[PDB]
């Protein structure tokens, strides 16, 4: 479906171009296979992110990475890629609003769940490759509030930093006050604990 959509758009297939046009255009890869080229990469990436965030032809786990410096758009769809959900940020504002929180408070007897959050285009799955092209806010409460500017262009925001931890390291109370080798030692001993 990705190839069909790009063919529907102005992506020029490699078979139908002279090599003279490759220098000033952006190469398009799909699962590492160079499909074709495209001459306006920015609006293309905007369209692809729009389709993914709406759960259109592009599914959520598909990852689009734009290397601007090298003029490449690599789209990945295969399995084995790791990703995680990040809240989408637009004009230094979360797309998450109080209405979504109210709907999630009545998660029961409303049939509003995480999948509707993804479908609403508020949270999206970002993989470690696409993280290189992401400017991420640690917490919305301060990192994107107006002040002496550090970065005024945030693309995503973490849900909670504590989710970087695994399973056995997340039962540590106050792990950020410990020496890290002892966090590791507890991550083993919790596996070894009786219960």
């Amino acid at each position: 479906p990705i190839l069909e959509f790009l063919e529907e758009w102005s992506m020029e297939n490699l078979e139908e171009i002279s090599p003279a046009a490759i220098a000033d255009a952006t190469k398009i890869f799909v699962n590492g296979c160079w499909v074709g080229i495209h001459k306006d990469p920015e609006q293309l990436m905007n369209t692809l992110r729009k389709l993914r965030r709406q759960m259109d032809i592009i599914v959520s786990e598909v990852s689009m990475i734009r290397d601007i410096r090298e003029r490449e758009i690599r789209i990945y769809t295969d399995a084995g890629r790791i990703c995680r959900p990040l809240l989408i940020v637009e004009k230094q504002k979360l797309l998450l609003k109080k209405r979504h929180i109210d709907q999630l408070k009545e998660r029961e007897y409303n049939n509003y769940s995480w999948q509707d959050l993804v479908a609403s285009g508020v949270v999206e799955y970002i993989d470690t490759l696409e993280e290189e092209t992401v400017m991420l806010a640690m917490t919305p409460d301060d990192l994107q509030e107006k002040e002496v500017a550090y970065c005024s262009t945030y693309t995503h925001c973490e849900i909670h930093p504590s989710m970087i931890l695994g399973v056995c390291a997340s039962i540590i109370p106050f792990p950020d006050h410990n020496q890290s080798p002892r966090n590791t030692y507890q991550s083993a001993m919790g596996k070894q604990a009786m219960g």
Binding site: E42, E132, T155
Partner: protein
């Protein structure tokens, strides 16, 4: 510096000397095709390589959100205050923390260094 190709097989023209006239000719091998070589320079290599990065910088990096933006330096082609600044971060752009600057204004991909 110049690279030239044949007109019948489009293979690489190798420089050659006609000593009968003491003239340089960019001749095609395996095609007996010859041209008047007028570049008069057959090899060069910039071992110093102070090559410009503003040539290598692509203006589309103005669209990058992860890059730093500043108002300290307005553009010199449109006067736009905002500009994106970064380093070469490349070999033969040898070790130097200097900043190259790109005008953030669309349709003005002006590059400079301070």
């Amino acid at each position: 510096v110049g690279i030239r190709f044949c007109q019948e097989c489009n293979n690489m023209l190798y420089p050659k000397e006609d000593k009968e006239n003491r003239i340089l000719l960019y001749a095609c091998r395996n095609c007996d095709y010859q041209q008047e070589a007028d570049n008069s320079c057959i090899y060069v290599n910039k071992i110093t390589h102070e090559v410009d990065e503003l040539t290598q910088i692509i203006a589309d990096v103005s669209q990058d959100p992860t890059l730093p933006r500043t108002e300290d330096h307005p553009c010199q082609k449109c006067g736009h205050k905002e500009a994106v600044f970064f380093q070469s971060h490349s070999a033969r752009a040898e070790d130097a923390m200097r900043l190259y600057y790109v005008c953030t204004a669309p349709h003005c991909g002006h590059r400079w260094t301070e």
